Design a protein around this ligand. Structure first.
Ligand SMILES: [Zn+2]
Lengths: 518, 431, 76
């Protein structure tokens, strides 16, 4: 119990108690106990994923056993799924494992709704047809899907979630919500309760720029420094006050390059606001959008063109009483600003017909403090990516202006798949084939480029390389993918960070990666 | 022996040539056997990066592998270091890590080294064809870095290429992390980039001892001032950052030394963090960086492709981003440069003013250096902080000027810090 | 002169800096639009790790030039 807390400590410092809950309640589905799939599962089972299930029709082969850290020599001959599951199981006794000795195709064929029991489905080393089919089935069931394939030194990763909205986007950096440009009642009363002459270096750097900006606002008829030249001057205006060498005074002098303009509803929040899912609410509108509306309504009424106050301020070299009392100035607007957003939610849930307390207060508070960091990611279904009429040519062609842009590796993968659809085998698996196939692969590429009318130059260098690969699954590449992939699953499950948009390509041969929107 | 198919995934890059191959590469049916038999690799660190690195190398074709680590398995590692079971707690990582692999992967032959990297000397490191890194501190990287550089011998200006033991080091921290490839004496060294590291967050004594605002200052107090002056658990006895009891006390005291100033945010979770300066960690990010490092090592030993040049940064907080660039090798680095660093000091210089150009200069910090020049064939040990004794029997020298200590122009000096094994030089200049 | 400085997450933002401005300000501008304290800002341009004391000119920064934000980590 409080034994787990000791084991998962380095991560709770990342997604917290609540993140750990979503995780410990999730049930992941892995499509193949290949090295790539096994690596991904390894990274989910360790942090605590509630339970998992492995679907795998294949038998463990010699090479299967040579590049898997979760399959042994004895495993050869046995069902790849069941075998892998036995060692993964040993990684964390708090995780419950399961396996289905059936094939994806076999399942998609009989029980088509087996996958509805899963939080997220991760499919690996899957042939084109199987992907398209599963992609379709899962898309119409509203089930997240992550397609990962290792080929030579190439990493392919395709996420497919119709809509994935998030409150805790965990931004690395972000301007503070100080409110100097648009100070609120309680805040101003504070700034006035002080005196710039009657503590020389114990006054918050904020109360400084405040009273020295309140001054300039009278020596030019309340105008805010906007031109750099103007800001530079406002700097020296505070310089002339350091009755002497002061740290905070000389500190406020750098805060000027920010503390002036911090208030401004961001683009991202704007688009959410103007999104139809926000403007048009019904009883199907997920809580995410109802809160995005309450924020909208807020900004209109109590908000005054602005989002609720964050409620937090940075560290500023100052007194141990001036700082804390200054902090409640915000900790209070925040609470009151949130209570208002909490009203808009109440009313809102009513014009719909849902119970007034269908959205907890914990949610609300988390919502308000993160209001500026909302993110909504929507991924084009796979079927659209593969469509003749819907392909995203522009994206492809544009990237191709660089003969070495990762996208070639994607195009090449489609060629290799067309090739597999044709020969019933991948390009150059045996050593004597590498020769002859270099040609057959080139024809397949050029044939794929036509069906879609993509007039791009693919170096002949890349057509060789992919035959050298012989559809190999180099553990270290698999291991990289396994790493990247699992954290995105963690994201979907916790709804705590921002998932890459469409496709992530990895070149282990140049050690570079890119994300596209196919 | 090995079973049919065991290394097919690895064979395709040694048995077959191709367009992205390296100029030295040569398709061979015999190269795999060679790599399993003769390639000595030394992983450095057995906690996460290290754990992931061993597996990767192991399944990549390397058999002759050594691991070094001075630590012991702690429960807080179990969420990312998959080579350790809770039953292994208390045991030494290098040993348990080696044991797991020698068992999980058929004929691997990892050799543990329950040691600090400073225990060994250059005799040791020459044994290896490659050094992979997964350290947990900067000083450690600066040290192993100096070590590898002090293994290079230049036959009259020209650097002997076979005196270069390639160095691959990875870094991690939350969802951000970075891999890297060094070729001691050619590519940029750990010191050539020393300034890419984040600033150091030190809470000024004024705000901890009197002006406590954050909940961390309340903890930093209980741990840095209140523990010494009221040696809770017996005099002399220091606080064990891993003692659930010690911490518990700091915590309890932090709660109080917080209310006295009305501050909230005092939790046990935060207490352990401040006290130990804990870094958030997860399996995934380590797995990534290490997969990268692993792959590079493979290229450098087989020449199946070209070694990543220099850097690679990776962030997983917003989608997946990775910038790859080529770090400039400062041709004036105190570490990998060819000759002494021409330092500039007017003859008036004091002396404690040199112990501060090295100590505080961004270009090359020094934790606690010691200068020593030559006056009468007799090598004067000007200042020092290594041995408490000599420290006093030298401290006064931090006042007499250069020539006021027999320091002519043109002649060099000698500094040696706990940050590097090699003796860094400096051709003093008056102007 | 207008330059782009790709962030630590790939987000590319453009900024106005006439040649003479020191790197030290190219950071001031970035902090202005993103909120990244300049202390922890490490700017990289063509492998050269832009010294915050030199100048955009000292690094041949020309309009369509892109600067990347990098980070070196301690843990392992
Ligand atoms: Zn160097």
């Amino acid at each position: 119990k409080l034994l787990k807390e000791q084991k998962y400590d380095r991560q709770l410092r990342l997604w917290g108690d609540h993140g750990q809950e979503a995780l410990e309640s999730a049930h992941v589905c892995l499509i193949n106990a290949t090295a790539t799939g096994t690596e991904i599962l390894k990274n989910l089972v360790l942090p605590g994923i509630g339970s998992f299930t492995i679907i795998d029709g294949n038998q463990v082969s010699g090479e299967d056993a040579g590049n898997n850290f979760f399959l042994q020599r004895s495993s050869i001959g046995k069902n790849r799924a069941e075998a892998a599951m036995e060692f993964l199981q040993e990684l964390n006794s708090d995780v419950s494992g399961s396996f289905v000795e059936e094939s994806p195709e076999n399942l998609l064929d009989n029980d088509p709704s087996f996958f509805c029991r899963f939080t997220v489905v991760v499919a690996t080393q899957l042939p084109e047809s199987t992907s398209l089919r599963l992609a379709d089935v899962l898309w119409n069931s509203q089930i997240p899907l992550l397609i990962c394939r290792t080929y030579g030194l190439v990493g392919y990763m395709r996420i497919i979630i119709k809509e994935h909205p998030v409150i805790e986007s965990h931004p690395d950096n972000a301007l503070e919500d100080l409110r100097l440009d648009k100070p609120f009642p309680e805040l101003r009363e504070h700034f006035q309760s002080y005196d710039l002459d009657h503590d020389h270096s114990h006054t918050p750097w904020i109360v400084i720029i405040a009273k020295y900006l309140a001054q300039w606002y009278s020596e030019t008829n309340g105008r805010i420094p906007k031109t750099y030249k103007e800001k530079e001057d406002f700097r020296d205006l505070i310089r002339q006050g350091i009755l002497k060498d002061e740290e905070n005074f000389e500190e406020a002098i750098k805060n000027v390059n920010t503390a002036l303009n911090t208030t401004q509803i961001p683009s991202s929040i704007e688009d959410i606001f103007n999104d139809d899912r926000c403007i048009n609410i019904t009883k199907q509108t997920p809580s995410f959008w109802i809160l995005a509306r309450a924020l909208k309504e807020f900004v209109a009424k109590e908000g005054q063109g602005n989002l609720p106050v964050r409620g937090t301020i940075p560290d500023m070299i100052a007194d141990s009483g001036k700082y804390i009392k200054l902090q409640n100035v915000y900790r209070e607007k925040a609470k009151k600003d949130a209570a208002a957003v909490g009203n808009h939610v109440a009313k809102l849930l009513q014009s719909i017909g849902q119970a007034p307390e269908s959205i907890s207060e914990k949610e609300l508070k988390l919502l308000c403090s993160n209001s500026a960091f909302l993110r909504v990611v929507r991924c084009r279904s796979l079927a659209e990516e593969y469509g003749l009429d819907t392909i995203n040519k522009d994206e492809i062609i544009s990237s191709m202006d660089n003969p070495d842009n990762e996208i070639v590796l994607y195009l090449m993968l489609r060629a290799v798949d067309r090739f597999h659809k044709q020969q019933g085998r991948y390009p150059g698996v045996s050593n004597y084939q590498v020769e002859e196939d270099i040609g057959k692969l080139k024809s397949c590429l050029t044939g794929f480029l036509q069906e879609y009318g993509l007039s791009v130059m693919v170096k002949d260098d890349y057509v060789h390389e992919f035959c050298r690969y012989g559809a190999a699954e180099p553990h270290t590449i698999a291991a990289f993918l396994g790493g990247a992939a699992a954290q995105e699953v963690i994201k979907i499950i916790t709804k705590q960070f921002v998932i890459f948009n469409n496709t992530y390509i990895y070149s282990g041969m140049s050690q570079t990666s890119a994300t596209f929107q196919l | 022996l090995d079973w049919e198919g065991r290394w097919n995934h690895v064979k395709k890059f040694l048995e077959r040539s191709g367009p992205f191959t390296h100029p030295d590469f040569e398709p061979s049916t015999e190269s795999l056997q060679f790599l399993l038999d003769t390639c000595k690799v030394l992983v450095i660190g057995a906690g996460g990066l290290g754990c992931e690195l061993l597996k990767n190398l192991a399944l990549s074709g390397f058999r002759q592998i050594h691991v070094i680590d001075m630590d012991t398995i702690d429960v807080s590692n179990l969420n990312r270091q998959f080579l350790f079971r809770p039953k292994d707690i208390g045991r030494p990582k290098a040993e348990v890590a080696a044991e797991f692999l020698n068992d999980r992967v058929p004929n691997c032959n990892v050799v543990p080294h329950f040691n600090k990297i400073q225990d060994f000397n250059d005799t040791f490191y020459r044994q290896f064809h490659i050094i992979v890194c997964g350290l947990d501190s900067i000083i450690a990287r600066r040290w192993i870095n100096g070590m590898l550089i002090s293994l290079l011998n230049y036959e009259d200006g020209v650097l002997d290429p076979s005196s270069i033991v390639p160095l691959i080091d990875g870094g991690t921290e939350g969802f951000k992390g970075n891999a890297r490839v060094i070729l001691p004496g050619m590519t940029a060294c750990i010191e050539c980039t020393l300034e890419l590291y984040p600033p150091q967050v030190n809470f000024p004594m004024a705000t901890i001892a009197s002006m406590p605002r954050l909940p961390e200052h309340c903890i930093e107090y209980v741990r840095m001032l209140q523990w010494p002056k009221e040696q809770p658990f017996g005099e002399g006895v220091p606080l064990d950052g891993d003692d659930p009891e010690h911490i518990q006390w700091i915590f309890q005291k932090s709660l109080e030394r917080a209310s006295q100033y009305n501050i909230r945010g005092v939790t046990y979770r935060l207490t352990q963090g401040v006290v130990k300066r804990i870094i958030p960690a997860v399996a995934s990010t380590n797995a990534v960086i290490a997969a990268v490092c692993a792959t590079e090592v493979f290229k450098i030993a087989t020449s199946a492709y070209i070694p990543l040049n220099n850097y690679l940064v990776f962030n997983d907080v917003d989608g997946l981003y990775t910038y790859t660039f080529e770090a400039e090798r400062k041709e004036n680095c105190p570490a990998c440069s060819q000759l002494p660093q021409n330092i500039q000091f007017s003859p008036s210089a004091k002396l404690q003013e040199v112990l501060d150009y090295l100590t505080n200069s961004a270009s090359l910090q020094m934790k606690s250096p010691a200068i020593t020049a030559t006056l009468e064939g007799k090598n004067r040990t000007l200042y020092l902080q290594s041995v408490t004794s000599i420290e006093e029997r030298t401290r006064p020298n931090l006042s007499k000027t250069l020539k006021e200590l027999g320091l002519v122009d043109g002649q060099e000096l000698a500094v040696a810090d706990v940050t590097t094994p090699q003796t860094v030089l400096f051709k003093l200049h008056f102007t | 002169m207008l330059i782009k400085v790709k962030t630590l997450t790939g987000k590319e933002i453009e900024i106005d800096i006439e040649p003479t401005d020191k790197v030290e300000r190219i950071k001031e501008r970035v902090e202005e639009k993103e909120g990244i304290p300049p202390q922890q800002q490490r700017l990289i341009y063509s492998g050269k790790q832009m010294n915050d004391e030199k100048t955009a000119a000292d690094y041949k920064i020309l309009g369509g030039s892109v600067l990347h934000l990098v980070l070196q980590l301690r843990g392992g």
